[PDB]
Amino acid sequence: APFIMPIASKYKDLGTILEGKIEAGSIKKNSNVLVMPINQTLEVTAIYDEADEEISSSICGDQVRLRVRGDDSDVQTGYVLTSTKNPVHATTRFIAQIAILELPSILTTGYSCVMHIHTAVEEVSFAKLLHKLDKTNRKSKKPPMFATKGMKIIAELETQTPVCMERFEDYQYMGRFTLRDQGTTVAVGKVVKILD
Amino acid sequence: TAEKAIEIWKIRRLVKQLINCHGNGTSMITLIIPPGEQISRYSNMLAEEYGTASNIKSRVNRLSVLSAITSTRERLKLYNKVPDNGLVIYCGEVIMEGNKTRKLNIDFEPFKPINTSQYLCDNKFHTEALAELLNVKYVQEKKLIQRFFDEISLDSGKYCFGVVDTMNALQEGAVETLLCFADLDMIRYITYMTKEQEEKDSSSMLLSEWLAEHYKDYGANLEFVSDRSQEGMQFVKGFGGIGAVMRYQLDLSMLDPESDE
């Protein structure tokens, strides 16, 4: 149980206010959180719940506003607050099951698009298609030359810059993501392995 | 549009290498003469610039400008009329690897550089002028690559995709349309390679350029596509950036596994 809170909003106002929803772990007043992936360290000097009232600590499933202390000029909506002991993972390469939905032509390696994992939104492109899947989610032993509508498949994905994520097998929310050829939603999918 | 864009292609390659190279001390002659003009006007203009340039005090730089203005002038002299609408000349010596320069002098007839007259002597080449010889362009590009993708979404068996394969398909019988990536990183010595040459211990053209000059002798039909579009990026990072929509299934022979030996 590490702390995990994807920063949904950030604004100044006699002090910085990062706000999000704790997805795992808890946070106490006067603790040190880590901003991933930038590995910035910040101090948490106040928690405010939805009632706008201060609290000494928030468990997960809480919708909180955190007042933080320290350099944050680099902290952006989409990053994640996490514990400095087991910081949430972040990477630019990962493998993931992907159900293709409305995807109006084909889908092959070079395919690039927008991925929304959690509070984050990021440019992603396919690196390699590894297998196809049929009914009883089986692992086609020849890698697909291409992919098509309504087709399960498992590929490798690359991002320009690191984004925090977790195996769907470990934290469902940190593992789901939908893909958008931002006309529309071309696919959904879940991360199956973080590649360092 | 057809064999027109194929030329715009080359202009784009040129502008790309001119602004890429840089020389020291204002010594890069750029000269653009629109149609209707007489050569003699610009000729004995450089002549004046030669006198003017003679007041520089920078022996190393002066001498440079002198030999550049000269190098331009008597190149310009080679022409008897500003050829059917247009004349462009880039001249000067540009720094090089190994610390040995290389005097450079290009002169060519474009496609109607309307009204664009220009002389400039800077420390770089001025290609802004050329820019006029350059998403209707992207839609066609996207439309074309999709036409090619269909031959994969349908499995038909008309397509390739691959250097060794596309070249062979072109070489052999026929290909209908050749899709090539504008900035294709491929050199044609016949054995093809990329920039994987610093390791190997292997007339010597750029595949890109060789196709632009011989494609005609094969039936195609050649289209240069840029990795601007989503299609492009796919076509480049997914299919080596070089391919074709054939007409009709081949068996891609010569040569590798099947083996077996």
| A120, HSE (Cβ side, Cα atoms, 13 Å) | 27
Distances A69 to A2, A18, A32, B100, B146 between C-alpha atoms, Å: 21, 10, 9, 56, 52
Q: How far apart are CA B184 and CA B240, in angstroms?
A: 9
Task: Give residues with Cβ within 8 angstroms of B3, minimum separation 6.
Answer: none
Calculate how close chain A gets to B152, using CA atoms only, in Å: 8
Q: How far apart are CA B63 and CA A171, in angstroms?
A: 72
What is the arrangement of strands in the sheet containing B242-245, beginning at the earlier edge strand? Answer: B222-225, B177-181, B242-245
Give the residue from chain A lying closest to B149, CA to CA.
A106
Contacts 24+ apart (CB under 8 A), B48-53: B49/B119, B49/B121, B53/B121
Element housing B118 (H / E): strand B118-122
Pairing of strands B222-225, B177-181: parallel
Decide if B247 contacts B174 (C-beta within 8 A): yes
Region of B39 on the Ramachandran plot (φ > 0 left; ψ -120 to 50 alpha; else beta)? alpha
Domain architecture of chain B: domains with CATH: 1-134 (3.30.960.10), 136-261 (3.30.1330.30)
Q: Among B149, B233, B236, select the one facing A106 at the smallest CB separation.
A: B149
Q: Which two tokens stand for residue A45?
A: 């000097």
What ranges in chain A are assigned the alpha helix state H?
A: 172-175
Distances A119 to A11, A24, A174, B205 between C-alpha atoms, Å: 15, 14, 10, 50
Experimental structure resolution, Å: 3.5
Strand residues in chain A grouped as ranges (E): 4-11, 16-21, 27-28, 31-36, 40-48, 54-55, 57-58, 63-69, 80-83, 90-100, 112-116, 121-133, 152-164, 176-181, 184-194
Domain architecture of chain A: domains with CATH: 1-88 (2.40.30.10), 89-196 (2.40.30.10)
Rg of chain B in Å (alpha carbons): 23
Residues B153, A108: C-beta atoms closer than 8 Å: no
Calculate how close chain B gets to A145, using CA atoms only, in Å: 8
Region of B156 on the Ramachandran plot (φ > 0 left; ψ -120 to 50 alpha; else beta)? alpha
Closest CA to A120 of A2, A3, A40, A7: A7
Q: How far apart are CA A62 and CA A21, in angstroms?
A: 6
Cis peptide leading into B255, omega within 30 of 0? Answer: yes
Size of interface A-B (CB pairs under 8 A): 35
Residues A108, B233: C-beta atoms closer than 8 Å: no
Task: Give residues with Cβ within 8 angstroms of A195, minimum separation 6.
Answer: A91, A93, A94, A95, A156
Whether A156 has its CB under 8 Å from any CB of chain B: the answer is no
Rg of chain A in Å (alpha carbons): 18
Calculate how close chain A gets to B150, using CA atoms only, in Å: 8
CA dihedral angle for residue A36, residue A37, residue A38, residue A43, rounded to 10 degrees: 0
Decide: residue B69, CB within 10 A, 0-12 exposed, 13-18 middle, 19+ buried: buried
Decide if B148 contacts B191 (C-beta within 8 A): no
Lookup result for tokens 């397509």: B159
DSSP string over B228-248: TSHHHHHHHHTSTTEEEE-SS
Helix (H, G, I), strand (E, B) or coil at B216: helix
Decide if B163 contacts B171 (C-beta within 8 A): no
Length in residues, chain A: 196
Q: How far apart are CA B38 and CA A187, in angstroms?
A: 63
A 10 A CB-CB count for A192 gives 16
